[PDB]
């Protein structure tokens, strides 16, 4: 049988995730339940109609008071803020996609296993000591022994792949990072109370500097980069697609075309399907629904002084990251016992 | 003998209200306390710095860890989400500006009176039987014996002034209205859960139909209008400033300029300071910080078949309305017995 998946937090990732899985033709997963605080009426509506993805090409209807139907496949919908109370044992859930953003440690995510699940994949950096994987960087090192795992952040999943190749190929000494990022649901629409005084500001009006750990987090998946990267994030008024700007001092002297041909060999080989190279003069919106964790903008590749490489990469922070959540869940399901 | 005022809910309206009041000379009011979920860090920062209003030209900073000072005037900052527990009796609070959006019934609103405040002005329509006032329209019917009152909506404050004139002078038979409205904090930034499936949708990406009770709330302040209007709202991807489009059948046959002239006359007389008439070809942004409840776009007035009359009015939903909250609070102060 297929592994039974429940999605906890049917928000942007939860929702992209379901749409990403549905389009897969080889899947070991079966999505049979969804929990979010808002009810079946929201579940069904907000899945059929999405302001960023457009309209789900599928027959999405309610099925009773407690479910929806997606192309005939029935999927139950529950509403409990407390994972402990969810009907996972009852429903036979094997894996939970943690898309709420609030259960990011063992004791919170753990509540799902308590309720009857056996695995939890968290769509966010883990808190504490959670095993962290990036498909195409260290996801081969996952073991079925690990019940709670993290897929890191969308920034980390764009960054790590091209850092793998840079270090392997040219050798990174140190580096720094800015992500110019689409606004996310943690920012206020208009100036309003927030614990972070910059996420408090009108998302759609502003360039908003914000804290990131994406640059240290790459060290979790690429240990050779420990201590070597730092960075910031600038949130800007686009609703989706982001870009990372990496500057590194490499040890092997090189030049833009050398760097791009290297990303280009990788794209063909060990990062097939994860890393891509773009040689057309495109803009953010063109990278919507890109299945690649990272798309090099080759025209922007620079080298100063033989060894200061600047590299620009594109990612669909909602869709491309959710395709990686799907892929990690396929690795979890393939390694079942 | 200045009335001691507290702001409950230091949000768009709570903050606009303070800045509005700050600009008045010889106010009958003294604002001596603020309460929000948020604490001084937030208070102080979101008052100085404003994406919509720009920097506050006053010396705003913390005093201690439970107050702020604004040009040296110390105002206390508390943070309790239960209005029953607020130190109003102690501080000798006379009026609370109920700016939270969540205490709009008597029960909720009355909790301030429990805590020791003597009067509550709700910056929103009331639920149930709460006396409702639009300055320039029925605020002279205010009685000091009423401990809980509403200043209605921003839309109701724009509409009622020019509905008053139209009915007085032409005789409204029935009508309909649409407001094209700046997004507000009640909508989601990106598609997410909301009890209203339309306000669920990314605000800054969409034209969003939503309900307005402005049409039937006009009858609260002008009783002859009962049963005669209906309307809708369309939220649009602007951060502030809204426009009402009114269409009425009238009993007196007319033409556009007679209608425009009648507003001009009112603006000279009984609606001085409340209603204005603009003859230049302006756009939403030019009405920011308009102190008028209603600014008719004279060049858009139209009459079809001598008795179907279309009128378009501009308002700054945040600043304009809050100028009317100060005015209503001044009317409370002046009628204090």
């Amino acid at each position: 049988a297929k592994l039974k998946v429940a999605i906890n937090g049917f928000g942007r990732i939860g929702r992209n995730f379901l749409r990403c899985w549905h389009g897969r033709k080889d899947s070991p997963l079966d999505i049979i339940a969804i929990n979010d605080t808002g009810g079946v009426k929201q579940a069904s509506h907000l899945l059929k109609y999405d302001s960023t993805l457009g309209i789900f090409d599928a027959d999405v209807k309610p099925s009773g008071e407690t479910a929806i139907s997606v192309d005939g496949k029935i999927i139950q919908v529950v509403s409990n803020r407390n994972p402990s109370l969810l009907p996972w044992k009852e429903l036979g859930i094997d894996i939970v996609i943690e898309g709420t953003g609030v259960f990011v440690d063992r004791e919170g995510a753990g509540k799902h296993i308590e309720a009857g699940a056996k695995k939890v994949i968290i769509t966010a950096p883990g808190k504490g000591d959670i095993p962290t994987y990036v498909v195409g960087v260290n996801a081969d090192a996952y073991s079925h022994d690990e019940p709670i795992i993290s897929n890191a952040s969308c920034t980390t999943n764009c960054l790590a792949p091209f850092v793998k190749v840079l270090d392997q190929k040219f050798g990174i000494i140190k580096g720094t990072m800015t992500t110019t990022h689409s606004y996310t649901g943690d920012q206020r629409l208009l100036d309003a109370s927030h614990r972070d005084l910059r996420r408090a500001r009108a998302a759609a009006l502003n360039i908003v500097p914000t804290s990131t750990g994406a640059a240290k987090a790459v060290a979790l998946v690429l240990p050779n980069l420990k201590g070597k990267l730092n960075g910031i994030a600038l949130r800007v008024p686009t609703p989706n697609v982001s870009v990372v700007d990496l500057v590194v001092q490499v040890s092997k002297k090189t030049f833009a075309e050398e760097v791009n041909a290297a990303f280009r060999d990788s794209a063909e080989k060990e990062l097939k399907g994860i890393l891509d190279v773009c040689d057309e003069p495109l803009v953010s919106v063109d990278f919507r629904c890109s299945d690649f964790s990272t798309t090099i903008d080759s025209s922007l590749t620079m080298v100063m002084g033989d060894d200061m490489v600047k590299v620009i990469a594109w990612y669909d922070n909602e869709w491309g990251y959710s395709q990686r959540v799907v892929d990690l869940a396929d690795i979890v399901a393939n390694n079942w016992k | 003998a200045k009335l001691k005022v507290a702001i409950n809910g230091f949000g768009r309206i709570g903050r606009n209200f303070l800045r509005c009041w700050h600009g008045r000379k010889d106010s009958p009011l003294d604002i001596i306390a603020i309460n929000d979920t948020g604490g001084v860090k937030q208070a102080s920062h979101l008052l100085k710095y404003d994406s919509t209003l720009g920097i506050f030209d006053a010396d705003v900073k913390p005093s201690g860890e439970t107050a702020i000072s604004v040009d040296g005037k110390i105002i206390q900052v508390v943070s309790n989400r239960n209005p029953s527990l607020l130190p109003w009796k102690e501080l000798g609070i006379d009026i609370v500006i109920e700016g939270t959006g969540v205490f709009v019934d008597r029960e909720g609103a009355g909790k301030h009176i429990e805590a020791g405040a003597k009067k509550v002005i709700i910056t929103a329509p009331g639920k149930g039987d709460i006396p409702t006032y639009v300055v320039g329209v029925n605020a002279d019917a205010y009685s000091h014996d009423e401990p809980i009152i509403s200043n209605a909506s921003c839309t109701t404050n724009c509409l009622a002034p020019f509905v008053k004139v139209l009915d007085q002078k032409f005789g409204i038979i029935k009508g309909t209205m649409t407001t094209t409205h700046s997004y507000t904090g009640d909508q989601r930034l990106l598609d997410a859960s909301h009890r209203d499936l339309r306000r669920a949708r990314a605000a800054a990406l969409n034209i969003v139909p939503t309900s307005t009770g402005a049409a039937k709330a006009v009858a609260l302040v002008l009783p002859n209008l009962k049963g005669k209007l209906n309307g809708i709202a369309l939220r649009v991807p602007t951060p502030n400033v809204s426009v009402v489009d009114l269409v009425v059948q009238v009993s007196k046959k007319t033409f556009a300029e007679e209608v425009n002239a009648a507003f001009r006359d009112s603006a000279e007389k009984e609606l001085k300071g409340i209603l204005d008439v603009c003859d230049e070809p302006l756009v939403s942004v030019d009405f920011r910080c308009s102190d008028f409840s209603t600014t008719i776009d004279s060049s858009l007035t139209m009459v079809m078949g001598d008795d179907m009359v279309k009128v378009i009015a501009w308002y700054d939903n945040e600043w304009g309305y809050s100028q009317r909250v100060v005015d209503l609070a001044d009317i409370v102060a002046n009628n204090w017995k």
Binding site: T100, G185, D186, R195, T212, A214, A233 | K41
Partner: peptide
């Protein structure tokens, strides 16, 4: 800090959400 302590117990609220990207 009032809001910081609130957010411990209510991480999913408007005034609390902090997405590390």
């Amino acid at each position: 800090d009032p809001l910081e302590e609130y957010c411990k117990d209510n991480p999913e609220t408007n005034e609390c959400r902090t997405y590390d990207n």
